[PDB]
């Protein structure tokens, strides 16, 4: 021996490798997840209580931890040394939640807000410049404590100025909105029933113009949508299908607390919305009477943590009731990853979860005060 | 869904689903139409709950007939998923029953919910 129909036969001959290299591919694989563990963040300086909250600095390579030890332990995460930058003990203030903040306009501004089961909240400008917020300006009845608070960006359209806002959970369906810097009571928002969780979504309008929307949910499943650029007026009402005993809610695919922006143009809308419950189901909604795209059922306990990847491709959902109750979900496939976590994966009673803004790092806190770090090789 | 009558309102569904979730923990809840049917045959049911959205709704239209004959309270909720949710099972439940127990630790609100369902009927 010595279009053409035999094209496909020839190309098979050329290579024995037929799986497309995932390096060029930018969409992570559906079922296989490439994760490698790194050294613990607190290994340099252990925490004496549970890691109540975790927060990555938006730009600088810093990680913030808080807990009932009453200290703001911040770590310089590099993946190999993870030494401690500084620590700030706050006597008589158990730490239930803490977070970094950077003014969307003045990038030089850096602040940390920490709160607990108290009638006051502390801010830390970046001896320490610490300041306490303890005045509600007549709305003291609606609120009993600042233990649950999130920080968002509000644009005053009439002047086009942008500033931060501190959101609080009221006693009876109430949400109190305070000025980030001046602490002034800006507006108040109400829903029927007991407020369980809330989040923030941003909808860009035009060049330099965006609106902030408050999403609030009752334990039953009614969801309220409030326009904070229009004095916190209702704009939409809908129910979570099959929802009962809601516990948490979050959005993803755009800017958020976990994935803050650095300038106005970076503001992006979230295309995902997920809602938890005490039993453990999570209804996923495509924000683009709504019907859930998927109803995850892998965990069998209360949803204590629910967070989206900065790109909105992975959902990290956790429960504090039992040990190792942590699952990662691929999006938009809505399929839980199998290879990780494993039986030998050390997670314990998960209580805090954090996604790095970039680099694809995972920080997971447990009751024992251990923050275990992982890297996603895909990013 | 005109057949399902009386249908509990949003507020009334709250307390019913709350009791159902409680009855699940204390093993005082019977889940499923036939299992609900058995309780009515044995006369051990405080009252019967059904889901309005179930399709075909005729699968549960027998329980009102049993309940009326046995003078047992009954009521419909809008969503079957939410019913099975409160029951504490991974599948939709279109009907469930609360077993009679005068020695239960959750007795009072069952009568309270029962008294309201009397008012609804």
């Amino acid at each position: 021996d010595e279009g053409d129909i035999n094209a496909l036969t020839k190309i098979l001959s050329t290579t024995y490798n037929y799986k497309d290299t995932l390096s060029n591919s930018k969409l992570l694989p559906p079922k296989k997840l490439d994760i490698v563990r790194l050294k613990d963040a607190n290994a340099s300086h252990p925490s004496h209580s549970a890691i109540q909250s975790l927060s990555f600095h938006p730009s600088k390579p810093l990680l913030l931890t808080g807990g009932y030890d009453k200290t703001l332990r911040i770590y310089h995460i590099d993946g190999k040394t993870n030494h401690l930058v500084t620590s700030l003990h706050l006597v008589g203030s158990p730490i239930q939640t803490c977070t970094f903040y950077t003014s969307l306009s003045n990038q030089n501004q850096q602040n940390i807000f920490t709160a607990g089961r108290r009638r006051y909240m502390h801010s830390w400008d970046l001896t320490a410049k610490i300041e306490k917020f303890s005045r509600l300006y007549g709305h003291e009845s609606t609120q009993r404590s600042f233990e649950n608070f999130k920080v968002a960006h509000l644009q005053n359209s009439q002047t086009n100025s942008v500033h931060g806002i501190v959101l609080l959970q009221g006693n009876n369906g109430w949400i109190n909105i305070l000025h980030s810097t001046s602490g002034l009571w800006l507006m108040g928002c109400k829903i029927e029933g007991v407020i369980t969780d809330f989040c923030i979504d941003y909808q860009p309008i035009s060049r330099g113009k965006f609106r902030t929307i408050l999403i609030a949910v009752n334990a039953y499943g009614e969801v309220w949508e409030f326009d904070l650029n229009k004095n916190g007026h209702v704009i939409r009402r809908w129910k979570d299908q099959g929802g009962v005993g809601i516990t948490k809610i979050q959005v993803g695919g755009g800017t958020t607390t976990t994935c803050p922006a650095l300038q106005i143009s970076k503001i992006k809308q979230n295309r995902w919305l997920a809602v938890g419950s005490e039993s453990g189901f999570v209804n996923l909604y495509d924000r683009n009477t709504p019907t859930p795209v998927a109803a995850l059922d892998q965990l069998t306990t209360t949803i204590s943590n629910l967070q989206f990847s900065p790109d909105g491709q992975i959902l990290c959902m956790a429960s504090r009731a039992v040990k190792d109750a942590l699952r990662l979900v691929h999006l938009p496939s809505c399929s839980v990853f199998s290879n990780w976590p494993t039986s030998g994966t050390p997670l314990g009673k998960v209580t805090s979860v954090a996604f790095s803004p970039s680099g694809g790092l995972l920080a997971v806190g447990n009751e024992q005060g251990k923050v275990r770090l992982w890297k996603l090789n895909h990013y | 869904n005109p057949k399902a009558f009386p249908l509990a309102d949003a507020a009334l569904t709250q307390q019913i689903l709350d009791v159902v979730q409680q009855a699940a923990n204390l093993r005082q809840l019977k889940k499923g139409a036939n299992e609900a049917t058995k309780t009515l045959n044995r006369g051990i049911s405080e009252f019967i709950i059904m889901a309005a959205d179930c399709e075909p709704i005729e699968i549960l239209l027998h329980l009102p007939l049993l309940c009326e004959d046995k003078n047992v309270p009954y009521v419909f909720v809008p969503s079957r998923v939410a019913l099975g949710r409160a029951c504490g099972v991974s599948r939709p439940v279109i009907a469930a029953s609360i077993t009679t127990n005068d020695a239960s630790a959750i007795k009072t609100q069952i009568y309270a919910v029962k008294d309201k369902i009397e008012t609804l009927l």
Partner: peptide, 12 residues
């Protein structure tokens, strides 16, 4: 069952 007294655990 879990039987901690039964622990609150979902049935799959």
């Amino acid at each position: 069952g879990s039987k901690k007294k039964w622990k609150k655990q979902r049935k799959r």
